[PDB]
Amino acid sequence: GMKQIEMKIEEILSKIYHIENEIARIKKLINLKANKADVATKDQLATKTEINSQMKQIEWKIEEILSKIYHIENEIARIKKL
Amino acid sequence: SGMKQIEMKIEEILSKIYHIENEIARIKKLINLKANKADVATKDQLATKTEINSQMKQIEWKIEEILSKIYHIENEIARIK
Amino acid sequence: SGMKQIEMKIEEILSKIYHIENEIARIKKLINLKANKADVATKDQLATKTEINSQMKQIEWKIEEILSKIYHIENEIARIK
């Protein structure tokens, strides 16, 4: 009877040691994870799609402007020609 | 009765250990759903909507100014003709 | 004395278990403060400040060129008059 109890205590102590090692590993893993407070949220961050769309609108206007300037320069050259 | 008491304590201990093992299994799954520090952007690397809006606005104002100058010039040229 | 020794081992085991339970409780709280993979924006979707700054600078250079062309044209028109 006593021997059987001793063997159960042995198994329990082994299980506990294993659990302690699991916990030690878990703590290390947690320390590698990012905190919610330190990570910029989707709400806060600009997406490539959004930026691309607004950049495209600007680019089209710049292209329009460049064409207008070229046309104007040609008109002026025509006006000033002898 | 001494042996019986020890057995009852062992029963409760084993139940507690089993519960802890199940908790640990659940924790490991939860950890796997969390983002690693190494896999995210470092503080202030990424562009915010506020910053982008401000930057775009400055460019937009300049473009609008330019378009106004062009319209005026086109009118001046039409008058010169 | 055999019984006494077992009883002492049980005392230590119960103390160890209580300590482990407290550790687990703390770990669960710590995990709840960590960011989820599902809630973090992907590399595919995000823009960096460096990338944006470079693109904005290229636009600024084009605007500077445009302004020089406009200024020149305004001067040409003033001369024509």
Crossing angle of the two packed helices C2-32 and A2-31, in degrees rounded to 10: 20
C78 touches chain B (CB under 8 A): no
Give the CB-side neighbour count of residue C18, counting CA atoms within 13 A: 6
Substitution target in C34, C69, C71, C79 with the highest count of B β-carbons within 10 Å is C34
Instruction: Give the method of determination.
Output: X-ray
- Give the closest residue to B20 by CA, choosing from C6, C28, A56, A37: C28
Choose among C10, C27, C81: nearest Cβ to B9: C10
C30 touches chain B (CB under 8 A): no
- Residue C54 CA from chain centroid, whole number: 21
**Contact state of B24 with A29 under an 8 Å Cβ cutoff:** no
The rounded distance, in Å, linking the Cα atoms of C59 and A63 is 11
Q: Are C37 and B34 in contact (CB under 8 A)?
A: yes
The rounded distance, in Å, linking the Cα atoms of A15 and A44 is 46
Choose among B36, B49, B67: nearest Cβ to A34: B36
The rounded distance, in Å, linking the Cα atoms of C8 and A32 is 39
Q: Are B48 and A44 in contact (CB under 8 A)?
A: yes
**Contact state of A33 with B38 under an 8 Å Cβ cutoff:** no
The rounded distance, in Å, linking the Cα atoms of C26 and C28 is 5
Which resolution in angstroms does this entry have?
Answer: 1.7
Backbone torsion region of residue B27, taken as left when φ is above 0, otherwise alpha when ψ lies between -120 and 50, otherwise beta: alpha
Residue C6 CB: number of other CB atoms within 10 A?
20
The rounded distance, in Å, linking the Cα atoms of B65 and C70 is 11
